[PDB]
């Protein structure tokens, strides 16, 4: 109650000043739930789906890629994300194939930071399939 939820891509806007009681965000260092008076933090995101529960009967299943959640002192949040798409624009069939090919290059990485780049890529496709 008496909350404000803002959800904006760089090119488009989903929510402006319209809050619905519960926001589920995948944090880099875990996960949380916004109880509309949550103790305020400054967190950053991991690849994972955002399921905003509208009042409105049902929920809203978005899927962010990397953004920033700023819940602040007054009861108001500002969730800004880079690639915030829904579910139906994605195809599951291409997401299955992209996993094991990046696992195949993981053994074939000679350097230490180039192999660390491969570990970033397999994590994002892992949250891709399990969200589907």
């Amino acid at each position: 109650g008496q909350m404000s939820f803002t959800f904006a891509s760089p090119t488009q806007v989903f929510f402006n000043g319209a809050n619905v009681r519960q926001v589920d965000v995948p944090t880099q260092t875990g996960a949380f739930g916004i109880l509309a008076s949550h103790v305020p933090t400054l967190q950053v995101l991991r690849p994972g789906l955002v399921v905003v529960h509208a009042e409105d009967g049902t929920t809203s299943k978005y899927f962010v890629s990397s953004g920033s959640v700023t819940v602040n002192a007054d009861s108001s949040v500002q969730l800004l994300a880079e690639e915030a798409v829904t579910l139906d624009m994605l195809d599951p069939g291409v997401a299955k194939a992209n996993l094991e090919k990046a696992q195949s290059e993981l053994l074939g990485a000679a350097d230490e930071a180039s192999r660390a780049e491969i570990q970033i890529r397999i994590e994002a496709n892992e949250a891709l399939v399990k969200a589907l």
């Binding site: 803002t6 904006a8 891509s9 760089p10 090119t11 488009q12 806007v13 402006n16 400054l42 920033s68 700023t70 602040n72 002192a73 007054d74 500002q78 800004l80």
Partner: protein, 55 residues
């Protein structure tokens, strides 16, 4: 001064006039696009700034 001098200077400010009319309609249709694309990028720009004012 002469008639050959007046005509050549007169034609040259016809081409400069016609080109700056063409370059007004081009850079005005680039303006209406940049006005529509600003309003989604305004609140996303305002919201990322909004943490520092409440501190």
């Amino acid at each position: 001064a002469t008639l050959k001098d007046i005509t050549r200077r007169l034609k040259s400010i016809k081409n400069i006039q016609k080109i700056t009319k063409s370059m007004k309609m081009v850079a005005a249709a680039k303006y209406a696009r940049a006005e529509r694309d600003l309003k989604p990028a305004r609140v996303y720009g305002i919201g990322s700034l909004a943490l520092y004012e409440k501190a």
